[PDB]
Amino acid sequence: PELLGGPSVFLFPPKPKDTLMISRTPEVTCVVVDVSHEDPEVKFNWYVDGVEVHNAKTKPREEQYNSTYRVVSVLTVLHQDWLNGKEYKCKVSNKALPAPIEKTISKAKGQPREPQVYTLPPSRDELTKNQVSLTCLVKGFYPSDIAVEWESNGQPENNYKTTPPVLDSDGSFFLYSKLTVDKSRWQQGNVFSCSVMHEALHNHYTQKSLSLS
Amino acid sequence: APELLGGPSVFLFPPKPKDTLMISRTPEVTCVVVDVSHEDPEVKFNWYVDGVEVHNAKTKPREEQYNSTYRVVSVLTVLHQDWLNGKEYKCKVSNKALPAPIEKTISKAKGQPREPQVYTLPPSRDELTKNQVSLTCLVKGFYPSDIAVEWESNGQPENNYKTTPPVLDSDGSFFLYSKLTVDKSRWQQGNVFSCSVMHEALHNHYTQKSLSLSP
Amino acid sequence: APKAVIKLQPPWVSVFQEESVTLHCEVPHLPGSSSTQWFLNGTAIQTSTPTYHITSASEDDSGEYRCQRGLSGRSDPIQLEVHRGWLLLQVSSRVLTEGEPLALRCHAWKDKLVYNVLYYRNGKAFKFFHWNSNLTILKTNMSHSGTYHCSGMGKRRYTSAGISVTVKELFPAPVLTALLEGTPVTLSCETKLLLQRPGLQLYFSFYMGSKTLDTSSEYQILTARYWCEAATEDGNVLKRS
Ligand SMILES: *[C@@H]1O[C@H](CO[C@@H]2O[C@@H](C)[C@@H](O)[C@@H](O)[C@@H]2O)[C@@H](O[C@@H]2O[C@H](CO)[C@@H](O[C@@H]3O[C@H](CO[C@H]4O[C@H](CO)[C@@H](O)[C@H](O)[C@@H]4O[C@@H]4O[C@H](CO)[C@@H](O[C@@H]5O[C@H](CO)[C@H](O)[C@H](O)[C@H]5O)[C@H](O)[C@H]4NC(C)=O)[C@@H](O)[C@H](O[C@H]4O[C@H](CO)[C@@H](O)[C@H](O)[C@@H]4O[C@@H]4O[C@H](CO)[C@@H](O)[C@H](O)[C@H]4NC(C)=O)[C@@H]3O)[C@H](O)[C@H]2NC(C)=O)[C@H](O)[C@H]1NC(C)=O
Ligand SMILES: *[C@@H]1O[C@H](CO[C@@H]2O[C@@H](C)[C@@H](O)[C@@H](O)[C@@H]2O)[C@@H](O[C@@H]2O[C@H](CO)[C@@H](O[C@@H]3O[C@H](CO[C@H]4O[C@H](CO)[C@@H](O)[C@H](O)[C@@H]4O[C@@H]4O[C@H](CO)[C@@H](O)[C@H](O)[C@H]4NC(C)=O)[C@@H](O)[C@H](O[C@H]4O[C@H](CO)[C@@H](O)[C@H](O)[C@@H]4O[C@@H]4O[C@H](CO)[C@@H](O)[C@H](O)[C@H]4NC(C)=O)[C@@H]3O)[C@H](O)[C@H]2NC(C)=O)[C@H](O)[C@H]1NC(C)=O
């Protein structure tokens, strides 16, 4: 105890889509909260697998609504570095801290496993209603970092929801994605696609189509 | 040393969803008190069903956790219709490490109940190449999230399944998916599998949808 | 003879159960060996010494205290509340006038330690302290009125109950109440007292940009060839046109 008090530090991973497309910019984010007005200056040190890097971008402090300050530092990461399991450490220093605070984040460990993507048409019983549910089953993938989207004729589908990843018996994850479309469009044979982005997929994506027979 | 301010904490838990819908079962609310110090171990419970105190609650003995604290639990049986009508259940904990008795209250989730729609989805054409195969049960449009989903076949429980958490849908209701994994042998032999769902908005609180190969 | 006055030591009008507080009945003309009459909610108290010591406060000690000694008037009441809780927002007074300091304390039960304390006004935290610390607002204005409470971190995050504090306004802001050269001139300032202040009176001034022109409550040319500034003598309640 004794020296209790001072800011806290939270370290956030990059978005899964951002690590799987080389044109996007994946970033790890180090957020310091509970910074006082009296001791406002915060210092960040970033390490990648234990050696310091100097290209992080640190935003100026911003007054929160609870009278405290918040300071954010963003480190752009290389896609392959994150995918290859490198450890990103943020070290936060401030005179209200008697010893710096260090946080470490990396990709979940374990051999990556490729997801299987199965589209399932609406059940016959659901056809009697106004809207029908198209379902994308994605199973057998590891780690849980994944992205699921729907598309038809080059445009996104607005009305879909995806369950969180669920741990399955064999240690892999599965999820379902429900796209709600008007029964008229489904019966007019319009083709709907479910796109899955995951690191264990060739080119980090696969796409499965689904339409009425 | 001047110790950090603080004492025990209290958590009040609702009955399991299967216990609320079957009169065959007994639903119960559970009051758990953690961080109970050895130096002040005495815990007192007062239960109030909708304001009036009741006394049918039984408290488990003090059990020490390895973080050198005590964890005392008091369980109180509740009536089915009282829980589902909206009765407020209040636990009152008293301890000398507390400045005042801590009070927590639990009740069924408010909001107009909505009936769940249940649909069985057979395996995908492409999954038939595997020898372990997925049977899917979609349950959508239900409120509140309190639901129970199981699988049966030939009078026996099929337990090799997993069910997603409830998910908030665009229309304010909830949906989930249940995946039952069966060997492709059983699916092609023509066995009938059943998805059993229990929810307060169901008639008789129960509905089941069955699934087997079309031809 | 003047009125008696009660003083609290500590000055906090809210205390925890089993805490200690001493009440002092002070008559400005100091008296010798006269008895002190103490009252709780109009009911006299056995104690007759010029101070009253509550050793282990209980709910029976809550209410309005007044006192009186010799030929003094009975004091204005002091309200004491006794509470239970993890944290208590202690104030020196519930009612104040503009320019009178307000002292706040986030008091932890049994004087235990909390850190990362927040002070709240009207639900919004306006001050943060890594280590538990009192907080004093010296130049109070009516905007400091509200419900105050506090929070802090012990083994868990704990939060005090609210308590309302009023800072009464002393006088609104001024303007100046008012052509051919060679000119009759009548001009005044824009405010007078709001509380019944018997022995208080305001000082007014007349400024334009940097060129200024006192207790003079009326400004006037010889015959005519801007701002009225209203501030107490203490210079702690400033209002401008
Ligand atoms: C004063 O106020 C500040 C500010 O709060 C704001 O203002 C006040 C006034 C309020 O109005 C408040 O509601 C406002 O939000 C307070 O600061 C807060 O402090 C608390 C702690 O007291 C923090 O709580 C942690 O939150 C984590 C999650 O935070 C995210 O989600 C919340 C909402 O859920 C958001 O509000 C946050 O901002 C975070 O949001 C994320 O932000 C990331 C970075 O910006 C985003 O990632 C980046 O995204 C960008 C795009 O913009 C790029 O793409 C980048 O590439 C990408 O990296 C991200 O998208 C975004 N997410 C979302 C959903 O928006 C929790 O994870 C954390 O829990 C951990 O720690 C707890 C201990 O405190 C513990 O109990 C938990 O169990 C958990 O512990 C973890 O457990 C797991 C096991 O499951 C372990 O494996 C882990 O190791 C372990 N971790 C740790 C660290 O131990 C906390 O709950 C809160 O985040 C913070 N808010 C903000 C805004 O900073 C402050 O507290 C107030 N002071 C006082 C005295 O009250
Ligand atoms: C000392 O040890 C004890 C013992 O803990 C256990 O023992 C050892 C071996 C350790 O390894 C521990 O890790 C281990 O867990 C500690 O006691 C624990 O104390 C914490 C609080 O510090 C409690 O956390 C709360 O948990 C509830 C939910 O807890 C259920 O789920 C756990 C698994 O997920 C399970 O372990 C629990 O036992 C409990 O499980 C339920 O048990 C009952 C049996 O009676 C059964 O009927 C249920 O079916 C069963 N459920 C399941 C899923 O198994 C969680 O809800 C609490 O979070 C609330 O409060 C937080 C702030 O306190 C807040 O951050 C949250 O947001 C949340 O707030 C709620 O938010 C929701 C919205 O999401 C809102 O609707 C609510 O209104 C709101 N409520 C409140 C009150 O705010 C909280 O996280 C542990 O449960 C408890 N463990 C046990 C076993 O009692 C103790 O802390 C240790 N002390 C120290 C100093 O370390």
Author numbering:
A (entry chain A): 232 to 444
B (entry chain B): 231 to 445
C (entry chain C): 19 to 196, 202 to 236, 240 to 251, 258 to 273
Share the article's original sentences.
All known Fcγ receptors recognize the lower hinge region of IgG with their receptor D2 domain. In the case of FcγRI, the lower hinge of IgG-Fc A chain, referred to as hinge A region, forms primarily hydrogen bond interactions with residues on strand C and C’ of FcγRI, while the lower hinge of IgG-Fc B chain, referred to as hinge B region, forms mainly hydrophobic interactions that include the “WPW” sandwich between Pro 329 of Fc and Trp 104, Trp 127 of the receptor. Unique to the high affinity FcγRI is the presence of three consecutive positively charged residues 173-175 in its FG-loop, which are not observed in the low affinity FcγRII and FcγRIII receptors.
All three crystal forms belonged to the same crystallographic lattice with similar unit cell dimensions and their structures were determined by molecular replacement to high resolutions between 2.3 and 2.5Å, respectively. The overall docking of FcγRI H174R variant receptor on Fc closely resembles those previously observed in which the D2 domain of FcγRI is wedged into the horseshoe opening of Fc to induce a conformational change in Fc from a symmetric to asymmetric dimer. Arg 174 on the receptor FG-loop forms two contacts with the B-chain of Fc, including a salt bridge to Asp 265 and a hydrogen-bond to the hydroxyl group of the second N-acetylglucosamine (GlcNAc labeled as residue NAG502) on the glycan associated with Asn 297 on the Fc. As the N-linked glycan on Asn 297 is conserved in all isotypes of IgG and the second GlcNAc is conserved in all N-linked glycans, the result shows a conserved FcγRI-glycan interaction with all IgG isotypes.
